[PDB]
Design a protein around this ligand. Structure first.
Ligand SMILES: Nc1ncnc2c1ncn2[C@@H]1O[C@H](COP(=O)(O)OP(=O)(O)O)[C@@H](O)[C@H]1O
Ligand SMILES: Nc1ncnc2c1ncn2[C@@H]1O[C@H](COP(=O)(O)OP(=O)(O)O)[C@@H](O)[C@H]1O
Ligand SMILES: Nc1ncnc2c1ncn2[C@@H]1O[C@H](COP(=O)(O)OP(=O)(O)O)[C@@H](O)[C@H]1O
Ligand SMILES: Nc1ncnc2c1ncn2[C@@H]1O[C@H](COP(=O)(O)OP(=O)(O)O)[C@@H](O)[C@H]1O
Ligand SMILES: Nc1ncnc2c1ncn2[C@@H]1O[C@H](COP(=O)(O)OP(=O)(O)O)[C@@H](O)[C@H]1O
Ligand SMILES: Nc1ncnc2c1ncn2[C@@H]1O[C@H](COP(=O)(O)OP(=O)(O)O)[C@@H](O)[C@H]1O
Lengths: 302, 277, 260, 287, 305, 300
């Protein structure tokens, strides 16, 4: 049987901190797609899916995480028939298997108004048969992604919060939570393309606990992978729990998402990484003072 | 023989609820074209909102159309019609071609189809019914700028202006605007058509051993919200999706057997009702 | 080439109001193909709202010369790739200098051109130069350069024609007399089925008046007359009605056609 | 052996009326070219000839007139190779005549000027021997010259008479790139056409307008006849219209409209226009 | 074993003067790039390197010299996007199993500031995607060093560092100091897509050339300017003697050219035009260059055989 | 073996009258290149920028210097530049990579060409559509007018000490072109830096115009004398008349382009009347050039 959304939600919870709304929406949508194929083999029309998440909040990771769980053909592509050619050779020419796949459209929010692809996608987000052999996009489920760089400003205009004079990141979380199709049209999309993608979700921008959580909680969290590199040097990196807070704050201040974590860590680790190679240091300690920059990292020597 | 347009209006009344006063024109034009098949071109253009039946009318008309049909949107489209459908080239000349999104070099080239021409064999395509469609986004603004003046004190021409060539505006001889939907349409659209939105969601929940009841007051509220975004026949889907996400998160394998929706629930004042073993 | 006498007899049947312009077009083209039968051409400018594209296709249907339409190669396709440069090019919306060598040979040296355009304010420019009344002023049409046309472009347009531009009673003739007038076509349409279709002579009077008050030329007669006969076409069929009639106040929206 | 310049002048004299000075300079320019190609087949350089034209002076027809007798491949226009390929097509791709040809460039009056700069000088795209001839109506250059006319700010023949004193200082002041002007060493002003020159233009040229129209009515079983005062009256109105030789054809076509229709079907034997006919006060009295 | 950072820094120091921070970052990174190759054969992922510096002052030289010390294929190109992997695959003798371990150097990335459309195209080769080299090849491991001049990026860091600021608030020294504060928001403010800044984690400021560093550049490193010129004169069998004060004068003159390492050539070229023109067959034994000679107070002295 | 630089100076002096300083820099530039293409088969090239106030040697310097070159040369106004060079060397890649390429009209660029040419100048692989080529050994000689740079440099030299907190000039001032000035003209410092050698060409004087008319090869008056000998007639121009021609060129302020425009005007009537209208010789005195006399004709 199709796995439930609580299996998928337990699975996605193993890689992305929370994002419970996006995790729920992906889960219910995939389940609805799998269930529909059992029946469809009244027509059961698909609903295309939209992710509005900013940089560094895991949109590609959510796709790539779901990708490792999909028992259904899936395609990864980025902003035409080569996309389905991927899916078809993924299938190994089983046309019936591809005709039920799910496609991820990375960086839809980059395309604006080329627009001819937006025009072109109208009749591929909706069903048409297409050659390479013919197969029909009618069931192919689309998941759309991008930062929609301006869209927050459009939402605030649509909310009239930018009004002035007399008249009759938490902020960004609130605004993105109230996206409207009026805004997605205004971000350079054609309204027909906004008219499809009936399900849209914000991904909430990551918070202070989320970043501290990201440093250890996920599989391949940031601290685990650094200390593995030090482990080849026969050294254990250790960081006090209080230093993780300032790192998170500093990377939150970088306004560049979870991948900003490695930049701050790279800077802090810099001196240790050059001095370690053969120097008979056994273990390297990083504390609050190191993160604050007030102290060079403390070295344990044999 | 072509059935009368009021009989054709039977077929379309089964699928698009509120466009009777454009559906009337379409039905008449088809009967004229068929009365033009033997013994002026009925070629046609659909205008107005997305999500309001432009493509559904085309596919529906073909569902009663004995002669083969092609739909396309903006030279091998007839090749699609010819290859799959057409065994008979007079039937292929007798085909119906829908050109949607036309309002989105080709315009000059379509004059060779709008007049019709030879534009294997290169058949005299004059017999083909070129029906056509598109958003024409902004036609109303041009019309508003022409229909009214800034009167002050105390007390086809639009299609050419939209950017279409005068020959092009002249050479699809019939045009219809289609209504923007209203709550009167939407409440019927929710349950009246075959394949309608609320039937499918109940079906989606019936395979999970549930009966979902949605009362008439719920639909009344939902129609209000669904029209606030222009996506029309897709505004139903977006707001039904947004509302029914949580019961669908908790229905599966969950020993729940019914949900009930009310105006407060649509308004967010109450959680979805569940009924359980 | 046939004398202009015969050319007039064909042309006259199709645009009744532009008697003067019919002569200029007919006489020039005969002499032109006479010199070819042996000699510079001279490009033609049509001064529109009155069937310029109708008139252009009229000559084409007469001569079967290469004919093509362009908006300010298709001709060799229109020539069926077969005279090679003796045809007519129609240039619409001429109301510029890059076509001058194209108006010359570029060969192109033989091509007769039919320019057309609504020179809005040429009356005021003629009113400037002079320091149906507006057509009578247009009958008085360097002055054309003063309206704003390129002198070099005007130089290749030495022949210029008013087009009887009011057409305001001849619409009634146009609704009736020409080779395929709209109301005779509708009679062929509805009476292709069993039904009658009388249109009273005072309905034509009001119908022409309607097109003129809307400030629509002969282009919009097929549309507006479609509206009156839409519901008749809708209500005739399925053996309902055979006797049908339209009358002047039905044009006025006051009433529905008769029946049995 | 290239023909002598006097013969080319008399040969070109047949087709364009009056303007000897421009014709004489263009005659020398062609003769010099065929002497240099005969002499470098030192290694003397080209010199391009620029024709300052009031519109309708015949500037284009004159070049065709030289092109007629000289049998040198010739082209005009107003991308860079788009003219040179036209010469290579016209030259029958004759590799030497492509190098030896003559090219017109029209209404030449910043990127376009600067891209042709090393095209006018000999460069390969082979321009090393192409004799460029050019035309331009640099209207107001006389006003630039007028501004140059000894103005001090501290304690119609005259227009031809002023254009007769043109120099490169005004043309840079006109807006031409100096490198382009330097590439155009010979500046020739065409004479403006008086009524006498326009009167000559109906009778003198090989293929003048009246011989053309008189031949069309001659093609019918008819004949076209015109008084000398009638020709003189036509010129007087034509000048008043401020239209050059382009406009003479138009004004003559207005007078002959009714005859052209009436005479066919063997109606009438001759038609005659007088001074009062020219004013439009009377229809021509066919016979 | 992979070469230690110790060796790389010492290897590069013979060719690149100063810039121990720039050398340290590159030294660590290529050693770390070796660690990934042996690990991925817990998953490690790449940190992309960005070098930004005043005009020409070591950026290209560091890359090429560092390129000389790579055991993996490398490719340097100037910012179609296929051309990156096209040249890497070509460069690797089409040995894909070694090519995917490659290091890519990008130049002039600063010039692609918002055009904007090129930034979004390489976002797939940064981080990871397969690339349609024909073959399809995966960029995920490839280590990218983005080099740009970022001319005027100091203008933005100065506006960012409150060196331009609003309200009551209550050159050489500044420029090197200012770039040492560079924030990610400054690359965003330059015109770089916030998406594209985010996947260039490691931002490396290269310091402006001090006057003493110019003195070392004249003689110390490999291919120093004066060694080049005595080779030219020794090919005319003539010697060139430059006093140490003349070095001080030349560097002081070159610092005034605001043109970095290329100014040494211009000042050196201008001085030796006549000697080089006169020596080749005049039996000149040696050429003497003093400080007054550099100052233009003397003609260059000749000693005849 | 390479020719000595002084030999190129004597050779270039035959075709170009003035500007020995420009000749000398190019002379050293060729000879340095010749040593460098042996040595590198390490040494690095210095490209050259020629500043030519309009109508002066720059395009002729390229052409006359080019005829010395055993290696190929290409003078063009972006990979087409490398394409043009490779074609001249008969697709012989080992000889083509050593060439001397002239990039004309560097002042006519905008930013895109400047910053796109950096990799060729500094050396990069480029393929002529393919043949793989390395531009490292291309010698670039660039020519551009840099119009109004004299006023730019003048302001630099005029605004100094001007604030309260403290043709003759064209030739004198333009000897002091500096990197700030080339940058300030609208050149990327990236581009100003990699053309280290800047060679300014002085304006042309009257004493030089007279010499050009007679002394160097293909001089203007001998060409007109040769043209007339082709018609079996001699052209005599006295020495005093040449002085007037140069004076008329100065007020034309079009340099060497203006000489032949002025001279061709005079020789129109001789060239129309002398052909096959038997004349022995024509003498143009100052009176004829002054426009106060018509050319005297010698006849049998
Ligand atoms: N909430 C999160 N938890 C764990 N990792 C995250 C989170 N947000 C972002 N990431 C990291 O973001 C990196 C880049 O992926 P992503 O942010 O999806 O790129 P983009 O958003 O530009 O498509 C991944 O390495 C992933 O580990
Ligand atoms: N009034 C309506 N009643 C029922 N369905 C409708 C109505 N309007 C639009 N639709 C639905 O819209 C969907 C898309 O077709 P349509 O909206 O006609 O195309 P477009 O989006 O190009 O206008 C169809 O599935 C159709 O069922
Ligand atoms: N006398 C006529 N007979 C038949 N059709 C006519 C006549 N006059 C105008 N028309 C029709 O009117 C339309 C032309 O409209 P008009 O505004 O004149 O545009 P155009 O300048 O392109 O002719 C065409 O459909 C043409 O067939
Ligand atoms: N002297 C002349 N002899 C014959 N035809 C002439 C003469 N002068 C002018 N024309 C005619 O009038 C026109 C001359 O103007 P043109 O050279 O076209 O001016 P432009 O080239 O500046 O537009 C040509 O059609 C030419 O035939
Ligand atoms: N510190 C330095 N030591 C030696 N040479 C240097 C130094 N800095 C710059 N250079 C010179 O500058 C060039 C290297 O950088 P460059 O190629 O100018 O960078 P870009 O890619 O910006 O042009 C070489 O000519 C090198 O000799
Ligand atoms: N000093 C000179 N001696 C001889 N000919 C010269 C001299 N200066 C310029 N010329 C002539 O003028 C041209 C060179 O000037 P050019 O480079 O075209 O000016 P610009 O620098 O504006 O491009 C050539 O045709 C050449 O014959």
């Amino acid at each position: 049987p199709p796995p439930p959304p609580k299996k998928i939600y337990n699975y996605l919870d193993k890689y992305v901190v929370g994002q419970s709304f996006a995790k729920k929406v992906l889960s219910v949508a995939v389940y609805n797609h799998y269930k529909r194929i059992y029946n469809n083999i009244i027509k059961l029309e698909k609903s295309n899916i939209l992710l509005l998440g900013p940089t560094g909040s895991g949109k590609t990771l959510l796709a790539q995480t779901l990708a490792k769980c999909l028992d259904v053909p899936f395609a990864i592509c980025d902003c035409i028939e080569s996309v389905i050619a991927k899916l078809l050779q993924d299938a190994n020419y089983n046309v019936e298997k591809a005709q039920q796949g799910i496609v991820f459209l990375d960086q839809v929010d980059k395309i604006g108004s080329g627009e001819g692809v937006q025009q072109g996608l109208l009749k591929l987000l909706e069903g048409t048969i297409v050659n390479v052999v013919q197969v029909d996009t009618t069931n192919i489920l689309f998941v759309a992604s991008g930062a929609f760089n301006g869209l927050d400003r459009i939402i605030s205009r649509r909310k009239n919060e930018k009004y002035l004079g007399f008249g009759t990141i938490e902020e960004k979380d609130r605004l993105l939570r109230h996206v409207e199709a009026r805004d997605l049209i205004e971000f350079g999309m054609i309204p027909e393309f906004v008219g499809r993608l009936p399900v849209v979700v914000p991904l909430h921008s990551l918070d202070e606990k989320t970043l501290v959580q990201i440093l250890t909680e996920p599989r391949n969290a940031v601290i685990p992978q650094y200390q593995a590199l030090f482990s080849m040097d026969k050294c254990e990196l250790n960081v006090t729990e209080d230093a993780l807070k300032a790192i998170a704050r500093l990377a939150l201040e970088r306004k560049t998402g979870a991948r900003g974590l490695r930049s701050i860590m790279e800077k802090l680790l810099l001196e240790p990484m050059f001095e370690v190679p053969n120097s008979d240091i056994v273990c390297v300690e990083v504390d609050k003072e190191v993160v604050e920059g007030k102290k060079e990292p403390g070295y344990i020597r044999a």
